[PDB]
Structure 1
Amino acid sequence: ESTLGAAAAQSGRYFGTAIASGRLSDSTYTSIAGREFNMVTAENEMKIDATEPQRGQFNFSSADRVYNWAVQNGKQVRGHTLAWHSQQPGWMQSLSGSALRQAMIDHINGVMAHYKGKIVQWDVVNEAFADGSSGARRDSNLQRSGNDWIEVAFRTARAADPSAKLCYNDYNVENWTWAKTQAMYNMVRDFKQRGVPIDCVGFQSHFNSGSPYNSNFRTTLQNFAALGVDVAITELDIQGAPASTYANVTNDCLAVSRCLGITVWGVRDSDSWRSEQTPLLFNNDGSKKAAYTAVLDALNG
């Protein structure tokens, strides 16, 4: 096949991107993204601050611009993200303990209701682990409310929209030997022991010199799949966009039956949150990079 999404679809997978509403008046962006991808994640517009800027008062305008663009252009949507320490609106930053717990639940319920039956995967919880050797939970108001915050988010989400696959998403969890990876593994293990309704694990896959790709990513994906969850590569970008690594990652997903697909975290290098690292598949001018060709070729076998 001649495009990433269609090539992924040959094996029942998707190839997605992050879409930013502020870029939707750029004709190069909309036409290349339209052509190439069959899955969309809103880069910002479905986060907590964007969707509930005051408690109880939702704003789906920008989120719906992204969602509607996606469906108009024949893409499914990953919802990103319902419960997270980052990008919280001030009113939520001020809450702790039981008040925060209620607000967390209410936020999940309100956003998921708006999209009920329309979102194939939700990143229900994002970035709950600390970096480094400890495997500890990250410090946040959410984590201070109790170790159960994550499981409660998942139980809430399952009741709100039984149709959605519920994902836990994180970064620096791709290398099987890292403590962070093992922390996430053991959480998912525990969740399965206790009936917590997690369906998927999202590997952000922000690869760079400090957190480099390792061939053992395939082992990580296999081992999580074996816990009884799907796996997804959710925010792929690679410092310098080497073709070799991009092919390796693609082939890792293709080798794991429950790997749903790959989302790259933007369209052109100039659209990247890390544009200085030129880490995506398209040049600033919209032309295809060597890494594009390597990914397409891998998807095509």
Structure 2
Amino acid sequence: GLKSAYKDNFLIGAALNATIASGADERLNTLIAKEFNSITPENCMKWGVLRDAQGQWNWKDADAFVAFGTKHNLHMVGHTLVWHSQIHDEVFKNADGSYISKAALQKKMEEHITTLAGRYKGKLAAWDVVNEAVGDDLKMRDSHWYKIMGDDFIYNAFTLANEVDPKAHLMYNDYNIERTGKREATVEMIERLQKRGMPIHGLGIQGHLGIDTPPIAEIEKSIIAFAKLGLRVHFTSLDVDVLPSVWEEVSTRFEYKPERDPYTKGLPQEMQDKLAKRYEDLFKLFIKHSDKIDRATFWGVSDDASWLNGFPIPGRTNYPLLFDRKLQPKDAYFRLLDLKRLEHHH
């Protein structure tokens, strides 16, 4: 499978939802063991999913994920310690809406990281310590984290994670950093935190790509720029959106319309071909820069369980991954295998 074909290049990973990570699906257990040598929990280690609004913890799904990776001897990436999404407003705010102090939030971060990264110390090889800190306007994202703590929210998150599990490979992770503008803003931020002595080992490019954009050349610039920071590059959340885009009026663009969901009956072969060529282009690039890249993780296993079916428009039928809704490999899968099977060396 993919993991074996790409053995000499990088890990091949998948994000697993809680149903998959339970181990109850024999067909996926088989598929995953064959294809992937790394996994990431799709949701269960996120603050607002793992904990309730009162801060109470429920380990069932997170433990099941770690048990699954241990059972199958898979490299495991924790996702994610500090992020502005899927986290209760109660972490940051009093019931009246007012923000708590920097000191009070720091205490909460310390408790969260110490507990979560501590539980799985030595079991998870890597952590997405901070996710999505640069805004799409290229300034620091105006989250509660940032408004209360400043850039110390990032510095302190990495410091704490490194104290709790000194052996973990600590990553900053973001989307659209394949693109000019955000790439450079991210480079500058990381540069300035590295200067301050922040422990950081890796840089995650999410890789939520469109069928057309961004071009390979922009992605290449990012691989090269982030590697120059002395960081290992990971592609963390790969998928290819094949459906009409709403990214380019502004307030109805997220509503369901049938014209924006044109493949409910199946993805036609011509689009299968385009999708296969797009993934092939991408993996050619990755192979080219295998010296800089530790991992390529897909944000799901099969198309039936992709988040892009419901984002950014609820209820669509998307086709973003390497396995179809019956778990059969798509044409894109075979193009990826052929890149390695037919590789030329001395």
Shift of 1:55: 5.2
SS at match of 2:161: helix
Q: Which residues of 2 match residues 37-186 of structure 1 at below 5 A? A: 37-53=36-52, 57-94=56-93, 96-98=100-102, 99-131=104-136, 134-145=137-148, 146-175=150-179, 177=180, 179-186=181-188
| 2:7 maps to amino acid | A
Listed as ranges, the gaps of 5+ residues in structure 2 are 94-98, 243-271, 310-316
Larger Cα Rg: Structure 1 or Structure 2?
Answer: 2
Runs of 4+ in 1 over 6 A off after TM superposition: none
| Mapping of residues 216-235 of structure 1, within 5 Å | 216-235=218-237
CA distance in 1, matches of 2:41, 2:61: 9
Q: Between Structure 1 and Structure 2, how many residues are aligned?
A: 294
**2: CA distance between counterparts of 1:104 and 1:37?**
32
Q: Deviations over 1:253-272 (max 9, x none)?
A: 22221210100011111110
In 1, distance between residues paired with 2:71 and 2:215? 35
By how many angstroms is 1:6 displaced?
Answer: 1.4
TM-aligned CA distance change 1:273 to 1:163, over 3 Å:
same
Cross-structure match for 2:284: 251
Stretches of structure 1 that go unaligned for 5 or more consecutive residues are none
SS in 2 for 1:88: coil
Query: CA-to-partner distance for each residue in 1:180-204, whole Å, 9 max, x for gaps?
Result: 1211111111122221111111001
Partners of 2:295 and 2:62 in 1: CA distance: 22
Cα deviation for residue 93 of structure 1 reads 4.2
C-alpha separation between the residues in 1 aligned to 2:72 and 2:205?
A: 25
Structure 2 match to 1:288: 329
TM-score (norm. length: structure 2) = 0.80
Equivalence for 2:263: none
RMSD between superposed Cα atoms in Å: 1.8
Question: Which deviates more, 243-252 or 221-230?
Answer: 243-252
Give 1:204's aligned residue. Answer: 206
Identity of aligned residues (%): 34
Shift of 1:299: 4.1
1:138-168, Cα deviation, whole Å (9 max, x unpaired): 1111010212211111111111111001100
> What is the rounded CA distance, in whole Å, between the counterparts of 2:332 and 2:122 in structure 1?
35
* Counterpart Cα distance in 2 of 1:122 and 1:162: 11
Q: State how far apart, in whole Å, the 2-side matches of 1:299 and 1:193 are.
A: 39
**Would the aligned equivalents of 2:216 and 2:285 in 1 still touch at CA under 8 Å?**
no
The aligned amino acid for 2:192 is D
- 1:5 maps to which residue? 3
Tell me the SS of whatever aligns to 1:237. Answer: strand
Contact persistence 1:20–1:44 (CA under 8 A): yes
Normalized against structure 1, the TM-score is what? 0.92
1:36 equivalent in structure 2: 35
Q: Which residue of 1 aligns with 2:26?
A: 27
What are the within-5 Å matches in structure 2 for residues 245-284 of structure 1?
Answer: 245-256=278-289, 257-275=291-309, 276-284=317-325
| CA shift in 2, pair 1:209/1:289, >3 Å | closer
For the Cα contact (< 8 Å) 1:97–1:144, is it kept in 2?
Answer: no
Asked if structure 2 preserves the Cα contact closer than 8 Å seen for 1:129 and 1:136, the reply is: yes
